[PDB]
Amino acid sequence: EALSLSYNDIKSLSAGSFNGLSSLRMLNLRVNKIESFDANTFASLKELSRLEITLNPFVSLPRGLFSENKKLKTLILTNNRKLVTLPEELLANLKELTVVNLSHNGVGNLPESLLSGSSGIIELNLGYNRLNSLPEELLSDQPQLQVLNLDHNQLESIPDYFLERNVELQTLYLSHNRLRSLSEKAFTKLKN
Amino acid sequence: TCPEESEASNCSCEEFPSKTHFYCPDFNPTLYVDVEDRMRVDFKCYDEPHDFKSLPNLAIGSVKLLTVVDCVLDDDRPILESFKFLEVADVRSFVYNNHENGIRYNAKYFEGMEQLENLTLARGVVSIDRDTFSGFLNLKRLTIEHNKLNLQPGTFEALSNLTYLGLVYNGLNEIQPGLFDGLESLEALSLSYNDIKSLSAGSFNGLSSLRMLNLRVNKIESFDANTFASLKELSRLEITLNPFVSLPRGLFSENKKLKTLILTNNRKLVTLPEELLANLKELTVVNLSHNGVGNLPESLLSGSSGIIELNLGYNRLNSLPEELLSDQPQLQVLNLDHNQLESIPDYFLERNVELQTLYLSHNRLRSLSEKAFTKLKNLKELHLENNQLQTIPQFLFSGTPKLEEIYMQNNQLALHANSFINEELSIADNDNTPFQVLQKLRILHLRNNSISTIFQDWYINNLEMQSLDLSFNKLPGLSYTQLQFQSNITLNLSNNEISQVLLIDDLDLQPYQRINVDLNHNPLNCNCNALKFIQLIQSKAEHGLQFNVDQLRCSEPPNLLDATMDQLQT
Amino acid sequence: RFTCPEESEASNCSCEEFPSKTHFYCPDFNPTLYVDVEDRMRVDFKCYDEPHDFKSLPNLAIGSVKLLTVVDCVLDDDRPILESFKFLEVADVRSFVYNNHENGIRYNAKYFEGMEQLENLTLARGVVSIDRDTFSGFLNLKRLTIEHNKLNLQPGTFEALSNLTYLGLVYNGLNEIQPGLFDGLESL
Amino acid sequence: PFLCESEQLLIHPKEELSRNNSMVWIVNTKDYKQGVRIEKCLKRQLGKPCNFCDADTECKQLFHYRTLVAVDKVTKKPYKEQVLLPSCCKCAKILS
Amino acid sequence: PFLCESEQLLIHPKEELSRNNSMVWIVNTKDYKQGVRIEKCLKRQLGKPCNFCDADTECKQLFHYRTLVAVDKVTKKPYKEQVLLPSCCKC
Ligand SMILES: *[C@@H]1O[C@H](CO)[C@@H](O[C@@H]2O[C@H](CO)[C@@H](O[C@@H]3O[C@H](CO)[C@@H](O)[C@H](O)[C@@H]3O)[C@H](O)[C@H]2NC(C)=O)[C@H](O)[C@H]1NC(C)=O
Ligand SMILES: *[C@@H]1O[C@H](CO)[C@@H](O[C@@H]2O[C@H](CO)[C@@H](O[C@@H]3O[C@H](CO)[C@@H](O)[C@H](O)[C@@H]3O)[C@H](O)[C@H]2NC(C)=O)[C@H](O)[C@H]1NC(C)=O
Ligand SMILES: *[C@@H]1O[C@H](CO)[C@@H](O[C@@H]2O[C@H](CO)[C@@H](O[C@@H]3O[C@H](CO)[C@@H](O)[C@H](O)[C@@H]3O)[C@H](O)[C@H]2NC(C)=O)[C@H](O)[C@H]1NC(C)=O
Ligand SMILES: *[C@@H]1O[C@H](CO)[C@@H](O[C@@H]2O[C@H](CO)[C@@H](O)[C@H](O)[C@H]2NC(C)=O)[C@H](O)[C@H]1NC(C)=O
Ligand SMILES: *[C@@H]1O[C@H](CO)[C@@H](O[C@@H]2O[C@H](CO)[C@@H](O)[C@H](O)[C@H]2NC(C)=O)[C@H](O)[C@H]1NC(C)=O
Ligand SMILES: *[C@@H]1O[C@H](CO)[C@@H](O[C@@H]2O[C@H](CO)[C@@H](O)[C@H](O)[C@H]2NC(C)=O)[C@H](O)[C@H]1NC(C)=O
Ligand SMILES: *[C@@H]1O[C@H](CO)[C@@H](O)[C@H](O)[C@H]1NC(C)=O
């Protein structure tokens, strides 16, 4: 029913590691030495509502990692070590994910179709990502959310068409950024 | 707020709600550092030492309560210096734990640490210097625990504002006469879990305003006659687990402000001195349980009228003096259980009137005078259980109308059906018994008694009875008459010798009234004329009577030996 | 613990002892008079049928009563009460109750000559009128109560009193509270 | 009507049982009982303040004592009994 | 403090009223003597209405049945035949 791996010395993830348990809804990884993954590692865990990975030296992720599980209510990625980039469409068509946190991940690039198809999100954080630039301007395509944090990022410009989809967005954070100017059209849709 | 530019630092901020965790060696978790919203910080070096030699700063600002756990120190350095990177300001409490390294202390350590109230060192200070605390501005509290410490006199030289100096598991072996010199305004002193050998009368010289002393674990073998003379303001003294065999006379005759005195587990203590607690008008709660006291001086409590509770349980006292309870009319709760007490002196309790509850259990009682309870107009409980009372007086409960709950479990009482309320000359509609007189009696526990009968008064005079425990009785049979309680009552007749249950079909209680009767482990005959009872058990839907009759089984009719009720065919 | 020191058959007045209360009655059959006595606190003097005299009755040594009660009993003209009840030997009394149903009389300070340390008091009936001060300022008259009396008062009749922590009137029939009747009740 | 909800109750005398007789017996003795009569309040099980009189009141249960005293036949000490029986349930005014 | 006031008495009765109605010469001999607490209602208050209330009710007097050896002078001859006796006053 519940599985957690906190302060574990395990340095790897096998796909067959988590087999023999269709009914798992909770997975916690507060600290681990894991650096490898596979999209099928969590495949068997279709009902895994929460996945939390932190303090792990993994440099990157495989495509279709969380895509297999459509029952994933929440995803947390905090204090990641040397995470240079993220796979495209990792959360594509989740349809259930409500909160995704990528805070403290050293990513230099952002994918427009990473979160596409998740019409449940209400909270999204990219804190301390330090993105050299924001390539993704089509993340508003799941406009149902209301919160956002892009603080401590090195992005030089904010795309004008980035915020044309959402109107229910309640709260926004852009501090510690490299913003020369703010778009004259992007804030006209943030009614809420 | 988490530290920006975290890329340069090895530390990682978890940015929880109202927390900010840290594990500064990010590769290997160590220095678990959090912050409770600038109210309290915390700091644990559990994994490996010296890991904070070159740590990046955290800029915490000011915080009230600091806490360091199991972290190394740099000896010649003030504490904040050793953790300069934290950048705390205005510490107001500094709890330190050091499971690993025993460090000598001195003044230098707390330089810059003033404006501090709650200091505490668990395993932190192996030995204390004479100048260590001089630097402090005002220090409301203090506490050193779980360490073997050596104390020099006057180390607390200039902690004038100190309050609740606490020593637990400190285990000092002896209090120096000048240990507390120069110390005042202590609203609390802790000597619990200490290895003290004796208490010289000068060992408490400095203290003047002390209001509470505690000796939960002490090895004190002897007191000086005036050990507690200087403690003129004292208000509470607790002694537990002390090997002293006797006390000096008039030890406490000076501490007139005293409020509560407790002595527990003095297995070597055998004889209290005369007038030990005389003339302490303030005293309100005295407990002397678990000692080895053998016999009480008659004037133990002369003039100490202010007592509310008194407790003498578990002693080895054998016989008691009436004069002891003569002038405490305020008393409320007495206790004498587990003594080898043999017989209450008849006029023992005639002075008190306020006594709520009384205890006498686990004694060798044999009998009670009618005069024993003649004056306890406000009594409301009673515990005569585990007493060898073969017989009781008929006019026992004349003077205690407010009695509620009475327990005589494991008694040797054998009042028969007749000859408890009758002399074969006068027939009584309601049996005249002491229990009959207490109308307001509700809970009763006569289990393991041999009365072997049910009294009519129990359900006539005692209208509000709620719990009856008649287990382990020799009663021959149960009759419907002997169960017309009407009021909600729990009846237990289990392990009894009952064999005949007589009912009548017209049996019906007041509406909404339900009584439960238990008849398990009884040698119940199952010949005819038990039929109506089988009907009230088998093929029973709902009524006033219930029957916890699970383990019962027919005994005597051979064709149906040991067949339970449900087994049986009418 | 008095237990009828005098022989019963001499006055026919018989009594029984118990732990609770050594009761008493004189006629010995269908008793007109009853002296209930709690061993320490209460005393109950009741004569529902008329009593012939207070001399033939024996002398029940009682030290003191934390409470006394006289019921339906004639009070002697211009005597202290205990003077009237000389046979009923009681010395120190703190409370008091009096419930004379029949033959009410006016009152005075004389009726309270030997009862000036009364914390309480009560005259449940038979109160015609209180001519002079109830107490001559007798000590610690914490409470007071006169009821069903059907009387009429005078203003400031009570002014001598000071410590009446409580005063109670029931069924007084009194038409009008005369001005200043409650004058002296400084600490009421 | 009455101020308190007092109900008459009959109590049967305690029946002597011939458990020696394993054979069944006439319930005629069980059929007729001389019994005694008592009184109790069910006014909220004797809790009513005697509503229709508004003065501060609470219904009480009252008892009566029967004193039968006989010197013993063996000329032992005189035997006196004071059996107590619930006799009435009456309402009393109370203070505040 | 009581709406109805009752004088307490001890009677030691002889020829008391009963159900059978054949109870005469009750036993109160100085050696065999039986008495019974009774609550006689005050004479003047038999019909005058209860006080401390506006109830139109009078202080009526009940009766109750007690076990006494009243049927015969010999004691235990009637097995305590029930006699009628006065009880408390209820409005
Ligand atoms: C003994 O305990 C039982 C609980 O097992 C008490 O039963 C309760 O009795 C009262 C009245 O006697 C019931 O109240 C009734 O409620 C109905 C509605 O359901 C209402 O129409 C009636 O007018 C009445 O108010 C109550 O429901 C009942 N509760 C249960 C759980 O049985 C009983 O009162 C107790 N008896 C004594 C003498 O203590
Ligand atoms: C004179 O009459 C007064 C009547 O008020 C007696 O004093 C009062 O006695 C009652 C006892 O029924 C006390 O009531 C109890 O008092 C305590 C403490 O306040 C309270 O916690 C209980 O809940 C309950 O009320 C009452 O305190 C006491 N005093 C007063 C001012 O009412 C007094 O004993 C009578 N004197 C004699 C000699 O009998
Ligand atoms: C009302 O209460 C007050 C105070 O409780 C009563 O005043 C007290 O009256 C007595 C009677 O004289 C005084 O006792 C006397 O004290 C002196 C000095 O100690 C002593 O030399 C005498 O031998 C006698 O013992 C008492 O001091 C006095 N207390 C106060 C505070 O004034 C008063 O009598 C009560 N009654 C009325 C109607 O006011
Ligand atoms: C020093 O310690 C005392 C003792 O606990 C603290 O006082 C407590 O404060 C809390 C906060 O409301 C109360 O709930 C407790 O009842 C208090 N106890 C006592 C004995 O006073 C005090 O807050 C601490 N001060 C600092 C600066 O740490
Ligand atoms: C004990 O506390 C008192 C106040 O609680 C301190 O008194 C102050 O002392 C300073 C200098 O020591 C003076 O300037 C203030 O005027 C004093 N104020 C009061 C209200 O007394 C005292 O210093 C403290 N002493 C110790 C040893 O802790
Ligand atoms: C019923 O009571 C008797 C008497 O109190 C209990 O017998 C005692 O049992 C204890 C514990 O085993 C012994 O120490 C005593 O010596 C026994 N006393 C006698 C005189 O036999 C008995 O155990 C109780 N039975 C229960 C608990 O139902
Ligand atoms: C009744 O007493 C017996 C023995 O004392 C015990 O085993 C049983 O559990 C009791 N029943 C209840 C309901 O307490």
Q: Is residue D44 part of a domain?
A: yes
- Residue C113 contacts B where some CB pair is shorter than 8 Å: no
Q: What is the DSSP letter of B23?
A: B
Three-state SS for E65?
Answer: strand
**Beta E6-10 vs E32-41: how paired, if at all?**
antiparallel
Q: What is the DSSP letter of B373?
A: G
Q: Inter-chain contact B29–A55, Cβ cutoff 8 Å?
A: yes
Domain hosting E53: range is 6-91
Q: Inter-chain contact E90–D2, Cβ cutoff 8 Å?
A: yes
Q: Is residue D1 part of a domain?
A: no
Q: Inter-chain contact C48–E9, Cβ cutoff 8 Å?
A: yes
Rounded Cα gap, residues E9 and D96, in angstroms:
31
B contact test, residue of A29, A33, A102, A152 with most B CBs within 10 A: A152
Specify whether the CB–CB gap between B295 and B270 falls below 8 A.
no
**Beta C33-36 vs C64-65: how paired, if at all?**
unpaired
Q: Is residue E82 part of a domain?
A: yes
Q: Using a 6 Å CB cutoff, which residues line ligand 6?
A: B 386, 410, 448, 472
- Radius of gyration, CA atoms only, chain A: 17
Dihedrals phi, psi of A44, to nearest 5 degrees: -55, -30
Rounded Cα gap, residues B467 and B491, in angstroms:
7
Q: Inter-chain contact B399–C18, Cβ cutoff 8 Å?
A: no
Rounded Cα gap, residues C89 and C62, in angstroms:
6
Specify whether the CB–CB gap between B359 and B310 falls below 8 A.
no
CATH number for the domain harbouring residue E74? 2.10.90.10
Specify whether the CB–CB gap between B468 and B454 falls below 8 A.
no
* Experimental approach taken: cryo-EM
| CB crowding C140-175: b at 16 or more within 10 Å, else e | ebbbbebbbbebebeeebbebbebbeeeeeeebeee
Q: Is residue D67 part of a domain?
A: yes
Rounded Cα gap, residues B446 and C165, in angstroms:
48
Q: Reading across the β-sheet that carries C98-99, which strands appear in turn?
A: C14-15, C24-25, C33-36, C44-47, C70-71, C98-99
Angle among Cα A128, A130, A131 to the nearest 5 degrees reads: 130
Three-state SS for B425?
Answer: coil
Q: Is residue D27 part of a domain?
A: yes
- Radius of gyration, CA atoms only, chain B: 34
Find the ligand nearest to C166 CA.
2
The Cα-based distances of B415 to B12, B412, C111, D23 in angstroms read 80, 10, 54, 29
Length in residues, chain A? 192
> In the structure, do chain E and chain A come into contact, i.e. share 3 or more CB pairs under 8 Å?
no
Q: Is residue D30 part of a domain?
A: yes
Q: How far is A21 from chain B (nearest CA, A)?
A: 30
Q: What is the DSSP letter of E2?
A: B
Specify whether the CB–CB gap between B501 and B478 falls below 8 A.
yes
Dihedrals phi, psi of A123, to nearest 5 degrees: -130, 135
Specify whether the CB–CB gap between C171 and C148 falls below 8 A.
yes
> Residue C67 C-alpha to ligand 2 middle, in angstroms?
13
Rounded Cα gap, residues B446 and A95, in angstroms:
69
Inter-residue long-range contacts of B208-212, CB under 8 Å, 24+ positions, other chains counted: B208/B184, B208/B232, B208/B233, B209/B184, B209/B185, B209/B233, B210/B186, B210/B234, B211/B186, B211/B187, B211/B235, B211/B236, B212/B187, B212/B188, B212/B236
Three-state SS for B165?
Answer: strand
Q: Is residue D25 part of a domain?
A: yes
E contact test, residue of D66, D74, D76 with most E CBs within 10 A: D66
| CB crowding E48-65: b at 16 or more within 10 Å, else e | eebbbbebebebebbebb
Q: Inter-chain contact C30–E7, Cβ cutoff 8 Å?
A: no
Q: What is the DSSP letter of D14?
A: P
Specify whether the CB–CB gap between B406 and B434 falls below 8 A.
no
**How far from the centroid of its chain's Cα atoms is residue C142's Cα?**
16
The two tokens of residue B547 are 């029957």
Secondary structure element (H or E) that encloses residue E9, with its range: strand E6-10
B contact test, residue of D12, D82, D83, D87 with most B CBs within 10 A: D83
Q: Is residue E1 part of a domain?
A: no
Find the ligand nearest to B156 CA.
5
DSSP assignments along A53-81, one per residue? EES-------TTTTTS-S---EEEEES-S
Q: Inter-chain contact E10–C25, Cβ cutoff 8 Å?
A: yes
> In the structure, do chain A and chain D come into contact, i.e. share 3 or more CB pairs under 8 Å?
no
Find the ligand nearest to B515 CA.
1
For atom 39 of ligand 2, which residue has the closest CA?
C95
Torsion of CA D10, D16, D22, D26, to 10 degrees: -50
Specify whether the CB–CB gap between B135 and B158 falls below 8 A.
no
Give the distance between the most distant pair of CA atoms in chain D: 63
Specify whether the CB–CB gap between B485 and B515 falls below 8 A.
yes
Q: Which residues of B touch E79 (CB under 8 A)?
A: 427
Dihedrals phi, psi of C149, to nearest 5 degrees: -75, -35
**Ligand 2 in reach of C41 Cβ (< 6 A):** no
Rounded Cα gap, residues A149 and A101, in angstroms:
10
Query: From the CB of residue C111, how many other CB atoms can be counted at a distance below 10 Å?
Result: 22
Q: Which residues of D touch B436 (CB under 8 A)?
A: 83-84
Which amino acid is it at D33? K
Torsion of CA B333, B338, B340, B342, to 10 degrees: 50
Q: Which residues lie closer than 8 Å to B391 by C-beta, 6 or more apart?
A: B367, B413, B414, B415
Q: How many CB pairs under 8 A join B and D?
A: 78
Q: Taking the CA of residue B424 as centre, how many other CA atoms within 13 Å lie in the half-sphere pointing to its CB?
A: 4
**Ligand 2 in reach of C95 Cβ (< 6 A):** yes
Instruction: State the total domains in chain D.
Output: 1
The two tokens of residue B391 are 């017989």
Rounded Cα gap, residues C65 and E23, in angstroms:
43
Give the distance between the most distant pair of CA atoms in chain C: 57
Q: How many CB pairs under 8 A join A and B?
A: 32
Q: What is the DSSP letter of B512?
A: T
Q: Reading across the β-sheet that carries A26-29, which strands appear in turn?
A: A2-4, A26-29, A50-54, A74-78, A99-101, A123-125
Q: How far is B245 from chain A (nearest CA, A)?
A: 55
